[PDB]
Design a protein around this ligand. Sequence first.
Ligand SMILES: N[C@@H](Cn1cc(Cl)c(=O)[nH]c1=O)C(=O)O
Ligand SMILES: N[C@@H](Cn1cc(Cl)c(=O)[nH]c1=O)C(=O)O
Ligand SMILES: [Zn+2]
Ligand SMILES: [Zn+2]
Ligand SMILES: [Zn+2]
Ligand SMILES: [Zn+2]
Lengths: 258, 258
Amino acid sequence: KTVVVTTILESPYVMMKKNHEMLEGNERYEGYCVDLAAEIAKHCGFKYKLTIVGDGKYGARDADTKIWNGMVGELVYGKADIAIAPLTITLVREEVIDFSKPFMSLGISIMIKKGTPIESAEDLSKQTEIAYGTLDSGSTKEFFRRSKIAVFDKMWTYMRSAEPSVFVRTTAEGVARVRKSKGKYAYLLESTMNEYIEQRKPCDTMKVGGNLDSKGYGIATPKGSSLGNAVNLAVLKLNEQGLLDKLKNKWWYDKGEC
Amino acid sequence: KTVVVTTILESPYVMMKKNHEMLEGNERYEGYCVDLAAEIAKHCGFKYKLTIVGDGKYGARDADTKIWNGMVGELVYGKADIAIAPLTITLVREEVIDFSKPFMSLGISIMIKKGTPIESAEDLSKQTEIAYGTLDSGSTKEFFRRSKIAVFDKMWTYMRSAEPSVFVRTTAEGVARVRKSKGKYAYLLESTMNEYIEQRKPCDTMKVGGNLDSKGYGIATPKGSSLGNAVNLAVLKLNEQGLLDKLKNKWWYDKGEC
Ligand SMILES: N[C@@H](Cn1cc(Cl)c(=O)[nH]c1=O)C(=O)O
Ligand SMILES: N[C@@H](Cn1cc(Cl)c(=O)[nH]c1=O)C(=O)O
Ligand SMILES: [Zn+2]
Ligand SMILES: [Zn+2]
Ligand SMILES: [Zn+2]
Ligand SMILES: [Zn+2]
């Protein structure tokens, strides 16, 4: 009966509330996806439990074991009924789980420390002084691994071989590396995250250039789940009624510190 | 056997070729959706025939008879197997037909004659010297009919009762109205169309302000069509390989005349 929702701690989508140790169950968390889950649940008429994905991963299939990890894995192996998270709709995932129409649009983007002489991916690919990398697992790293586009292939060829690693375990790690590297590390990350961090103190980062690609986040369910239809219709209704635009403003810009 | 594709003449998605009269079948047409249809068919392995929707409409349900018209109607009543067009994914349509994930993002936007003293929807709403309207049927009109947002509800109240009608039968008529009205008509239209027209001679229009909403176009099939799965996967593959971005550049900006 109670729907198990898998999600991931990624600001400002899902965050621990300041007083979380005093709170129980779903009340421990806040953020864009916490708000969205409550609306999806109200509109589809189900009770739910938010659970943070155990391995802290979005979802990839291991080439060796062929096992899926992360939120995708939780759906594929029946540990969760729905994923409500900044989970990128991709072909390889759509083969194993179902996605709603997108609730947010985004693209891969460049984050620099202010004053870094970089305006584009082409700029990054033509030089070697400034290192650059991505989140170590996820759709951004896979975009680069798989790209046949010359500039992105060049960038991947550099990143896959760079030592020490240019890849990071978490967005927070990537942002800290930008901030601490004196302009010598740029971070490739999803544009929505880039925009959020740009509005956070110490206000020393910025998004530069256009997005490298265009894609979306969707709500995911196990392939063939009965919940999928209602969830998809709910996403469409909430977009049409302006809920999604309101939530982005609430969590990105209303609180902006810059 | 051969898949019947319904589409609509709307630039630069589907246009007749300059020499279209010396050509037959699918060869009469060119454009973003013509190229897209070719790629979808190649990846899904079907042969197809492009047909222009008989009533020239996108699709809406008659409130009295409950009959669907336009491309949506062609799918609903089994006259076509798939619609490959700038067809907006909406809740009411998703209830009666299936949509792929979106192949293009867009939002409602404002087109003005250059020099018109308007920067936003709010500006249009606060004045009466400059008239404004939308395509007389389709998702844009419906956005205003249904909007609870104050500025948009205000705009709708004006538009529904304006005389003579501020509504137009085709985009071409809307653009012509802007161009001939000496700044006294502004046109509300999908951002993709607005961006295309801004780059065509006589180069006398521009898009102003941000988009009023965010949505997507999707490839549509009849509810429960087997074709639906393959087509959806095909759209995701085409996006991931950069083909959709290549097509947008080809049809909007490579050709730019301004
Ligand atoms: N959304 C991605 C995960 N993800 C997240 C961020 Cl913030 C990023 O910059 N890159 C990613 O791959 C996915 O679903 O794999
Ligand atoms: N895409 C829409 C139709 N459509 C098209 C244009 Cl160009 C517009 O400005 N407004 C619309 O409603 C639909 O699917 O109804
Ligand atoms: Zn804590
Ligand atoms: Zn609600
Ligand atoms: Zn002719
Ligand atoms: Zn292809």
